[PDB]
């Protein structure tokens, strides 16, 4: 993203995604069932538009807000979760949509009629990417509450490709010194272009990495089935202290199913169910069959932890992951994507299309330098580190972005089927709480020592 055209086109694609997400719903559906990981769809439209007004329009020009009264109800730090479900505090779908279209145009007008300063470019890209972050959240809200799939989605998956080849195997990464992260904004003149990144990715550093071997494929449903069948969820030997506790919790196992509440402990991935001997998976409003060569998704950090124990494998660190995905070494050329530094949306399962139902050996054009496949895309891969600041951290213009979720969260890397590709990078770092089954998470195993 440098050209105004790319920005403007990205602005438009984003607005459509939000509009398609809210208007494809009926009035009786606009109020979503309460869940700690979902938000009301109209609020996400308003909140994601407010960001433009705050960190682009007012930031650079001093312009006032569309409606100053809502300046505290759109803010995420102030407006608490539970009181977001109000019907008297917030405007209607009709007005909120108009708000968006206005600010979108106001954004387009500035991008066109005001200098392309590196400052503007940076803020332009930040604000857009933020809305895409809420496009993902809105998409998994449907899965959580059990609503129909988004109109722009092909949840059935990649049909025909189904042909898991022999690419399955491990890749021994040679030991040596490798480069992890992005330059700091103050040290680069491409901070808005070729060195763009959030605070969590900066400042860069070098690491002397020991040799290791990571699976070129993700863990598939079939493999996880054996762990379940061998009694994994009932053999506490494989689970850790948090895992054991997670396992001993009572939950409505029928959430987002349309069926009455059924409270109990988890014995299989939350979204799995056995029907007359056949494993099935809830895909929004439809229970489809569980293809075996597809990757296991919507699992917890604990669930993966136990599998790695039962399988005699281990989880990678985020620095192993980045090495194995980009293979950037100090002094040599640098890549942002495993294939290179140019983004083709066709080399990865992203942008809310196949939504994870892809064979784990597919997308060979996105092969990592060490053979690793489907690194960037499909699901967010669990790592074994805790989200912590890189040594040298500097808060961003929006300082709550990463600071609010340190230590309590685990670093996940890669990209989600529900996440827009325009914001992904090998350096990118996401942060999810280990107890979560609602986000599009996955994992691959690394070899033991
Ligand atoms: Fe936000
Ligand atoms: Na991935």
XYZ file of C-alpha atoms and ligand atoms in Angstrom:
451
model
C 0.000 0.000 0.000
C 1.608 3.261 -1.228
C -0.553 4.352 -4.136
C -3.629 6.415 -3.307
C -5.562 3.988 -5.530
C -4.643 1.017 -3.337
C -5.733 2.934 -0.255
C -8.992 4.136 -1.777
C -9.747 0.655 -3.098
C -8.939 -0.760 0.368
C -11.172 1.832 1.980
C -14.056 0.730 -0.233
C -13.588 -3.055 0.158
C -13.635 -2.564 3.928
C -16.812 -0.462 3.981
C -18.584 -3.082 1.861
C -17.568 -5.841 4.255
C -19.100 -4.006 7.211
C -22.226 -3.043 5.262
C -22.696 -6.623 4.067
C -22.232 -7.834 7.629
C -24.967 -5.688 9.227
C -27.606 -5.279 6.497
C -27.683 -9.036 5.716
C -29.115 -9.449 9.234
C -32.724 -9.042 10.316
C -33.812 -6.528 12.919
C -34.519 -9.362 15.356
C -30.910 -10.501 14.858
C -29.221 -7.122 15.358
C -29.272 -7.797 19.112
C -26.858 -10.722 19.431
C -26.944 -13.171 22.370
C -24.557 -12.024 25.077
C -21.118 -13.737 24.995
C -17.842 -12.412 26.476
C -16.082 -12.603 23.093
C -18.662 -11.022 20.777
C -19.898 -7.466 20.386
C -23.083 -5.945 18.888
C -22.589 -5.570 15.119
C -23.850 -2.007 14.857
C -21.491 -0.907 17.632
C -18.521 -2.376 15.745
C -19.547 -0.322 12.708
C -19.673 2.848 14.827
C -16.522 2.140 16.861
C -14.473 1.248 13.748
C -15.608 4.482 12.035
C -14.846 6.611 15.084
C -11.184 5.545 14.839
C -10.942 7.436 11.526
C -12.369 10.574 13.108
C -9.932 10.362 16.016
C -6.630 9.198 14.587
C -6.891 10.651 11.089
C -9.361 13.499 10.666
C -9.140 15.327 13.980
C -5.498 14.230 14.376
C -4.259 16.030 11.253
C -6.804 18.810 10.668
C -8.629 19.457 13.963
C -12.053 18.716 12.456
C -14.863 18.178 14.976
C -16.805 14.946 15.336
C -19.935 14.069 13.388
C -21.786 13.899 16.712
C -19.685 14.941 19.712
C -22.221 13.355 22.053
C -21.092 9.870 20.976
C -17.382 10.553 21.512
C -17.465 8.548 24.758
C -19.804 5.758 23.657
C -17.681 4.677 20.698
C -14.434 4.645 22.697
C -13.379 1.070 23.549
C -11.435 1.958 26.743
C -14.450 3.794 28.209
C -17.570 2.010 26.942
C -17.599 -1.275 28.901
C -18.706 -4.519 27.344
C -22.039 -5.185 29.046
C -23.572 -1.741 28.584
C -22.815 -1.937 24.821
C -26.042 -3.913 24.282
C -28.195 -0.811 24.925
C -31.005 0.188 22.562
C -31.413 3.746 23.890
C -27.765 4.884 24.019
C -26.738 4.130 20.439
C -28.178 5.132 17.029
C -29.995 2.885 14.604
C -28.568 0.757 11.829
C -29.797 3.444 9.426
C -28.036 6.367 11.082
C -24.870 4.440 11.920
C -24.591 3.388 8.260
C -24.914 7.013 7.215
C -22.184 7.965 9.708
C -19.851 5.419 8.080
C -20.538 6.522 4.469
C -19.894 10.139 5.502
C -16.557 9.476 7.215
C -15.539 7.101 4.411
C -16.080 9.890 1.887
C -14.305 12.379 4.169
C -11.393 9.931 4.247
C -11.400 9.575 0.465
C -11.466 13.345 0.025
C -8.384 13.853 2.211
C -6.419 10.987 0.621
C -7.049 12.694 -2.727
C -6.940 16.432 -1.955
C -4.216 16.566 0.690
C -0.467 15.826 0.465
C 0.654 12.219 0.833
C 2.927 12.942 3.794
C 4.456 9.852 5.382
C 2.499 10.882 8.503
C -0.810 10.790 6.632
C 0.103 7.484 4.937
C 0.926 5.859 8.308
C -2.318 7.075 9.886
C -4.309 6.207 6.720
C -3.092 2.605 6.843
C -3.434 2.244 10.625
C -7.070 3.327 10.695
C -8.122 1.157 7.754
C -6.392 -1.914 9.209
C -8.234 -1.292 12.477
C -11.600 -1.563 10.746
C -10.481 -4.827 9.165
C -9.702 -6.024 12.695
C -13.377 -5.474 13.455
C -14.382 -7.161 10.199
C -12.823 -10.370 11.605
C -14.470 -9.979 15.009
C -17.885 -9.444 13.342
C -17.387 -12.565 11.253
C -16.624 -14.854 14.180
C -19.458 -13.327 16.147
C -21.745 -15.115 13.669
C -20.063 -18.431 14.339
C -20.264 -17.930 18.114
C -23.930 -16.961 18.271
C -24.878 -19.415 15.504
C -26.072 -16.872 12.920
C -25.915 -17.616 9.163
C -22.522 -17.284 7.445
C -21.558 -13.924 5.882
C -22.848 -13.330 2.342
C -19.318 -12.863 1.003
C -18.098 -16.205 2.384
C -17.563 -19.683 0.913
C -17.526 -21.644 4.188
C -17.873 -25.020 2.429
C -14.152 -24.754 1.688
C -11.745 -25.705 -1.103
C -13.491 -28.462 -3.069
C -11.502 -30.534 -5.597
C -8.061 -29.518 -4.280
C -8.662 -32.212 -1.614
C -5.429 -34.164 -2.307
C -3.137 -34.127 0.774
C 0.182 -34.992 -0.960
C 3.523 -36.154 0.550
C 4.694 -32.615 1.427
C 3.965 -33.696 5.013
C 7.188 -33.868 7.019
C 9.580 -31.876 9.169
C 12.112 -29.220 8.171
C 15.419 -28.981 10.009
C 16.176 -25.264 10.274
C 19.962 -24.753 10.297
C 21.321 -23.076 13.410
C 22.766 -19.570 13.071
C 21.969 -15.889 13.554
C 18.641 -14.626 12.215
C 16.747 -11.333 12.165
C 13.482 -10.955 14.107
C 11.209 -7.962 13.851
C 10.914 -4.639 12.069
C 12.934 -1.404 12.391
C 11.766 1.221 14.800
C 9.846 4.096 13.281
C 12.404 6.700 14.391
C 15.244 4.830 12.629
C 13.588 4.243 9.234
C 12.399 6.622 6.543
C 10.105 3.811 5.291
C 8.215 3.656 8.581
C 5.044 4.425 6.584
C 5.818 2.137 3.649
C 8.255 -0.788 3.480
C 8.877 -0.754 7.267
C 5.277 -0.286 8.428
C 4.263 -2.233 11.541
C 2.620 -1.974 14.930
C 4.516 -1.412 18.136
C 4.531 -5.140 18.995
C 6.777 -5.855 15.957
C 9.419 -3.263 16.842
C 12.339 -2.765 17.481
C 14.189 -5.406 15.442
C 16.912 -7.615 16.913
C 19.170 -10.531 16.054
C 19.008 -13.959 17.662
C 21.438 -16.878 17.701
C 18.947 -19.681 17.114
C 19.714 -23.378 17.730
C 18.773 -25.787 14.986
C 15.206 -27.146 15.168
C 12.639 -29.074 13.091
C 9.042 -27.879 12.585
C 6.219 -29.699 10.820
C 5.746 -28.472 7.273
C 1.993 -28.963 7.787
C -0.551 -27.982 10.403
C -2.127 -30.534 12.693
C -5.200 -32.001 10.982
C -8.575 -33.108 12.341
C -7.663 -36.745 11.727
C -4.590 -36.564 13.964
C -6.515 -34.758 16.710
C -9.241 -37.420 16.443
C -6.818 -40.111 17.635
C -5.875 -37.985 20.674
C -9.566 -37.598 21.507
C -10.249 -41.325 20.929
C -7.259 -42.396 23.060
C -8.958 -40.577 25.983
C -6.881 -37.399 25.905
C -9.508 -35.202 27.557
C -9.772 -37.806 30.372
C -6.055 -38.603 30.978
C -4.861 -35.641 33.108
C -1.250 -36.742 32.544
C -1.163 -34.739 29.303
C -2.699 -31.525 30.672
C -0.927 -28.792 32.611
C -2.105 -26.932 35.700
C -4.114 -24.362 33.764
C -5.160 -27.104 31.365
C -6.504 -29.326 34.134
C -8.425 -26.334 35.513
C -9.751 -25.370 32.084
C -10.889 -28.989 31.652
C -12.854 -28.938 34.954
C -15.194 -26.065 34.031
C -18.956 -26.275 33.445
C -20.171 -24.572 30.257
C -23.243 -24.519 28.027
C -21.992 -27.041 25.453
C -24.947 -26.028 23.227
C -24.072 -22.352 22.719
C -24.791 -21.062 19.217
C -26.572 -24.309 18.377
C -30.165 -23.108 18.623
C -30.818 -25.865 21.204
C -31.546 -25.320 24.890
C -28.671 -25.009 27.347
C -26.721 -28.140 28.181
C -24.133 -27.622 30.933
C -21.067 -29.795 31.327
C -17.349 -30.280 30.865
C -15.489 -30.283 27.578
C -14.525 -33.656 26.137
C -13.868 -32.749 22.473
C -13.203 -29.509 20.576
C -16.182 -27.286 21.492
C -17.434 -27.114 17.886
C -17.224 -30.893 17.241
C -20.030 -33.446 17.674
C -20.436 -37.163 16.893
C -23.582 -38.114 14.894
C -24.227 -41.864 14.550
C -20.508 -42.531 14.698
C -19.429 -39.746 12.311
C -17.640 -36.640 13.611
C -19.357 -33.393 12.554
C -18.426 -29.692 12.756
C -20.709 -26.676 13.194
C -20.171 -24.249 10.269
C -22.292 -21.251 11.323
C -25.930 -22.426 10.983
C -25.157 -25.878 9.487
C -23.555 -29.009 10.887
C -21.246 -30.334 8.150
C -18.955 -33.371 8.187
C -15.426 -33.187 9.540
C -13.037 -33.735 6.605
C -9.931 -35.491 7.947
C -7.170 -33.702 5.987
C -8.428 -30.300 6.963
C -6.712 -28.437 9.826
C -8.123 -28.535 13.335
C -9.402 -25.036 14.258
C -11.125 -23.185 17.132
C -9.133 -25.016 19.808
C -7.547 -23.724 23.019
C -3.901 -23.434 23.976
C -4.525 -26.161 26.558
C -6.060 -28.513 23.967
C -2.949 -28.137 21.798
C -0.641 -28.480 24.825
C -2.063 -31.895 25.718
C -1.893 -33.062 22.093
C 1.801 -32.143 21.924
C 2.393 -34.196 25.073
C 0.440 -37.228 23.875
C 2.286 -36.958 20.536
C 5.791 -36.477 21.978
C 6.166 -33.142 20.174
C 6.370 -29.494 21.284
C 4.981 -26.090 20.449
C 7.263 -23.575 18.639
C 8.350 -20.208 19.948
C 7.361 -17.103 18.005
C 11.034 -16.563 17.061
C 11.347 -20.120 15.734
C 8.100 -19.437 13.845
C 9.334 -16.228 12.230
C 12.670 -17.838 11.327
C 10.933 -20.868 9.778
C 8.561 -18.532 7.881
C 10.735 -15.728 6.482
C 14.364 -16.940 6.947
C 15.641 -13.361 7.110
C 19.254 -13.134 8.233
C 21.101 -9.958 9.296
C 22.766 -8.229 6.372
C 20.967 -10.158 3.616
C 17.740 -9.275 1.805
C 14.472 -9.209 3.764
C 11.019 -10.662 3.045
C 7.708 -9.738 4.712
C 5.790 -12.732 3.294
C 7.092 -16.327 3.061
C 6.942 -16.069 -0.758
C 8.595 -12.624 -0.928
C 7.467 -8.996 -0.471
C 4.471 -8.821 -2.824
C 0.998 -9.824 -1.671
C -1.225 -11.933 -3.925
C -4.484 -12.777 -2.092
C -4.514 -16.166 -3.826
C -1.567 -17.704 -1.943
C -3.267 -17.914 1.458
C -6.641 -18.692 3.048
C -7.625 -15.240 4.182
C -10.085 -12.403 3.382
C -13.144 -14.335 4.690
C -13.596 -16.941 1.967
C -12.763 -20.623 2.484
C -12.802 -20.085 6.273
C -10.376 -22.825 7.191
C -11.777 -25.752 5.177
C -8.672 -26.162 3.005
C -6.333 -29.192 2.756
C -3.313 -28.653 5.001
C -0.931 -29.294 2.073
C -2.560 -26.705 -0.229
C -1.298 -23.215 -1.238
C 2.177 -24.364 -2.318
C 2.951 -20.953 -3.816
C 3.024 -19.607 -0.235
C 5.624 -22.159 0.743
C 8.165 -20.930 3.259
C 11.867 -20.990 2.281
C 12.185 -24.160 4.417
C 9.110 -25.832 2.806
C 6.599 -24.922 5.559
C 3.160 -24.596 3.990
C 0.158 -22.428 4.867
C 2.103 -20.534 7.493
C 0.526 -17.167 6.678
C -3.233 -17.762 6.545
C -5.864 -20.439 7.405
C -5.724 -20.084 11.252
C -3.864 -18.170 14.025
C -1.065 -20.510 15.137
C -0.496 -20.875 18.893
C 3.072 -20.245 20.071
C 4.589 -21.164 23.425
C 5.610 -17.622 24.469
C 3.545 -15.037 26.327
C 2.855 -11.712 24.606
C 5.607 -9.496 26.034
C 7.214 -6.333 24.659
C 10.302 -6.580 22.498
C 13.261 -5.066 24.279
C 13.122 -1.390 23.275
C 9.336 -1.039 23.070
C 7.795 2.353 22.238
C 4.049 2.900 22.474
C 2.255 3.845 19.260
C 0.074 6.947 18.645
C -2.749 4.727 19.918
C -0.913 3.503 23.074
C -3.484 0.943 24.322
C -3.069 -1.367 21.294
C -0.598 -3.865 22.741
C -0.126 -2.645 26.328
C -3.584 -3.788 27.448
C -2.961 -7.488 26.627
C 0.568 -8.313 27.843
C 1.485 -11.383 29.903
C -2.164 -12.481 30.293
C -2.224 -13.335 26.552
C -0.212 -15.784 24.408
C 1.441 -14.741 21.150
C -0.216 -16.187 18.085
C 1.244 -15.791 14.628
C 0.199 -16.302 11.011
C -3.227 -15.109 9.867
C -6.868 -16.103 10.198
C -9.302 -17.199 7.478
C -11.469 -14.374 8.871
C -8.658 -11.828 8.775
C -7.972 -9.446 5.906
C -4.715 -10.098 4.097
C -3.887 -6.420 3.603
C -2.617 -6.236 7.207
C -0.675 -9.538 7.549
C 3.083 -9.957 7.714
C 5.503 -12.579 8.978
C 6.524 -10.089 11.732
C 2.867 -9.497 12.795
C 1.998 -10.574 16.354
C -1.546 -11.292 17.635
C -2.503 -11.945 21.273
C -5.200 -14.365 22.501
C -6.048 -15.683 25.971
C -5.178 -19.379 26.316
C -8.685 -20.426 27.483
C -10.440 -19.458 24.248
C -12.321 -21.627 21.769
C -14.145 -18.802 19.935
C -11.346 -17.443 17.747
C -9.967 -19.088 14.593
C -6.861 -20.603 16.186
C -4.696 -23.553 15.108
C -1.212 -24.968 15.679
C 1.619 -26.981 14.156
C 4.058 -29.168 16.068
C 7.784 -28.792 16.395
C 10.236 -31.657 17.001
C 11.487 -32.490 20.496
C 15.084 -32.629 21.708
Fe -11.100 -1.433 18.219
Na -1.284 -20.008 9.655
